[PDB]
Structures are given as structure tokens and as C-alpha cells.
């Protein structure tokens, strides 16, 4: 036995020496040296200093550049807002708590920081799915005589919020729960304890199938059809050097988007699957945060891939950052 249970938490450290304390009441310097909490605070500072400007500037240039306010760009703005939910609802709170050594805001603040951190990551998750669906519908033209408009773009954003609420609200009402994870400074969905009072097992399964398998299949199918459509069109039009460049660029971006999506959620998939299955084991609190590293950093590199590598957005941002001329 290598954990300590409480009414609303689970510290991954044995209490056979009597030093384990509540993560809501006292610093947790027995599961990690104080400098590791400082490095945890240092990494939260990095995500804030990089994640906020790049994501805020995306909303700013859209206000300034009329050509960016198109329906196909709504879901990109929804991506920037979701990243900001991760920055302020999660990153800033964790920077604060890590400087204390424990989660100072108690169980109520744990549900708050856990709801908005899960909501932010899920909106960004499903925004990448909706973006693939729209790009597949627009380019592959799978429906007969259909034009993507403003009402379809709004429903695409509303669909992400509904999927995120269908993913962060259940822990607040008794399906799974929010508890401090790893070094006990940030809160998330419980998959380290089989808390039968809230049915953690059926939620983790519903979490894995509906909110990871379904998104992964949809993204692979849509972008798979897109690369097929583009390569087919260019093959039937090899006299156009521009169409040959487009086929290469589109293929290169699809590989980058799919690989980045895997780097984001696959470590969180397997490592949390192992912690869930091989439960009650001697999970290092440092080992807990290995999947959280790749997923949380997506608040920084999703804007780089989906905004900064977009020609229309990058030109408007260079103009705005360079005082108005470039």
C-alpha cells in the first residue's frame, strides 16, 4: 500500500511514517522536494508567458482585420478562447498553488479549477475535431450542393461547448470527481482511485471511448479523405505547378496536425490508462505529470500550428505587431 486516502483526495504517498497531510491544508514536500514545486511553478510561468500573448493576439488581430472574420475562422477563435481558459482557469491557479506546496483553495476551488481546466482542454480538443469536419466538408464536397455558412460555423462552436460540458459537469454532480493530482497542486478527473460512490470506472471508459476514440477516428477519416482528394485532383492536373505545391503543403500540414494531436493526447491516453488499470501502484508524482506536460503545452503549440502557420493570420499579426506596416 503506497497511497493515503481522504474524504476528497488521494495523496500518492504511504502514510506509514505519519507525515502525509491533506493537500488542502499543508504543503506536500514529502512527495517532492521544494525545488520540484518551484520547477513546477517555473513551467506554469512559461505556459502563461507564451500561451497568453499568442492566444490573446489571435483574438486581437481578428478585431482589427476584417478579412479574418469569416465563418471558417470561428472555430480557430474558439480554439484561442479555449487556450485562454487553460491559461487562467488552470495555469495561473497552479502557479499560485505550487508556490504554496499544496492546493490552498480547498475542495470547492478544486472543483472550480478542475471544471475550467477540463472545459478548456475539451473545447480545444473538440475544436480540432470540428475544424477537421469543416475542412473535410468544404474541400471533399461529400454533400450534394452544400455551402458552409455562418449558421453552420456557429453550430460547430456550440457543438464543442456541448461536448465539453458533457465532459466537465458530470464530476460536479456525482459521475467521477475532481481531486488534486500528482504533486497535489492542480485538480482533475479522478482515474487513480476506483471511487465507487461516483462510478469512476464507467466514466473513465466513457471518457476514453467518446472523448478520445471518437475524436481520433473522426480526425483521421476527415484528414485522410482530404489528403486523398487533394492528391487525386493534383494527379489529374499535373500541368499546374501551383496545384502540385498545394498538394505538398496540404499533405505536410495534415501530417503535422495529426502528429501534434497524438503528441498531445496519446501520452495522456496510455499513461492514464495504465494508472487506471494497474491501479493502486507506486506511481511517482513526477511520473503523474508526464502526460500533463504534453497536453498542457498544447495551449502554446496549437496556436503555432493552427494560427501562426495560417498565411492569413500570420500576415495580419505581423502587420499588427510591426505597428501597421508589413
Amino acid at each position: 500500500m503506497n497511497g493515503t486516502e481522504g474524504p476528497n483526495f488521494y495523496v500518492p504517498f504511504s502514510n506509514k511514517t505519519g507525515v502525509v497531510r491533506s493537500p488542502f491544508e499543508a504543503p506536500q514536500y514529502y512527495l517532492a522536494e521544494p525545488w520540484q514545486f518551484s520547477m513546477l511553478a517555473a513551467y506554469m510561468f512559461l505556459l502563461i508567458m507564451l500561451g497568453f500573448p499568442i492566444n490573446f493576439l489571435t483574438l486581437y488581430v481578428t478585431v482589427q482585420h476584417k478579412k479574418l472574420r469569416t465563418p471558417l475562422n470561428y472555430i480557430l477563435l474558439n480554439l484561442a478562447v479555449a487556450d485562454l481558459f487553460m491559461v487562467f482557469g488552470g495555469f495561473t491557479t497552479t502557479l499560485y498553488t505550487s508556490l504554496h506546496g499544496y492546493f490552498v483553495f480547498g475542495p470547492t476551488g478544486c472543483n472550480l479549477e478542475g471544471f475550467f481546466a477540463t472545459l478548456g482542454g475539451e473545447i480545444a480538443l473538440w475544436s480540432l475535431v470540428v475544424l477537421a469536419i469543416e475542412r473535410y466538408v468544404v474541400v471533399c464536397k461529400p454533400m450534394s450542393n452544400f455551402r458552409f455558412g455562418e449558421n453552420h460555423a456557429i453550430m460547430g462552436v456550440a457543438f464543442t461547448w456541448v461536448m465539453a460540458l458533457a465532459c466537465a459537469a458530470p464530476p460536479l454532480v456525482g459521475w467521477s470527481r475532481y481531486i488534486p493530482e500528482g504533486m497535489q497542486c492542480s485538480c482533475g478527473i479522478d482515474y487513480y482511485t476506483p471511487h465507487e460512490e461516483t462510478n469512476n470506472e464507467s466514466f473513465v471508459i466513457y471518457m476514453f471511448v467518446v472523448h478520445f476514440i471518437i475524436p481520433l477516428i473522426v480526425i483521421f477519416f476527415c484528414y485522410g479523405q482530404l489528403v486523398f482528394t487533394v492528391k487525386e485532383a493534383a494527379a489529374q492536373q499535373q500541368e499546374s505547378a501551383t496545384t502540385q505545391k498545394a498538394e505538398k503543403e496540404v499533405t505536410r500540414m495534415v501530417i503535422i496536425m495529426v502528429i501534434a494531436f497524438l503528441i498531445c493526447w496519446l501520452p495522456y491516453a496510455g499513461v492514464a490508462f495504465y494508472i487506471f488499470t494497474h491501479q493502486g501502484s507506486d506511481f511517482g508524482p513526477i511520473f503523474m505529470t508526464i502526460p500533463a506536460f504534453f497536453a498542457k503545452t498544447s495551449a502554446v503549440y496549437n496556436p503555432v500550428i493552427y494560427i501562426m502557420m495560417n498565411k492569413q493570420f500570420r500576415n495580419c499579426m505581423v502587420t499588427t505587431l510591426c505597428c501597421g506596416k508589413n
Binding site: 469543416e134 468544404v138 503543403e249 496540404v250
Partner: peptide, 11 residues
């Protein structure tokens, strides 16, 4: 497809 690839920000 060149026009639709620009609309979705892929080219």
C-alpha cells in the same frame, strides 16, 4: 480545390 484550400487556411 485551390480556392477551398485557401478558405480553410491550408494553402
Amino acid at each position: 480545390i485551390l480556392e477551398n484550400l485557401k478558405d480553410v487556411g491550408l494553402f
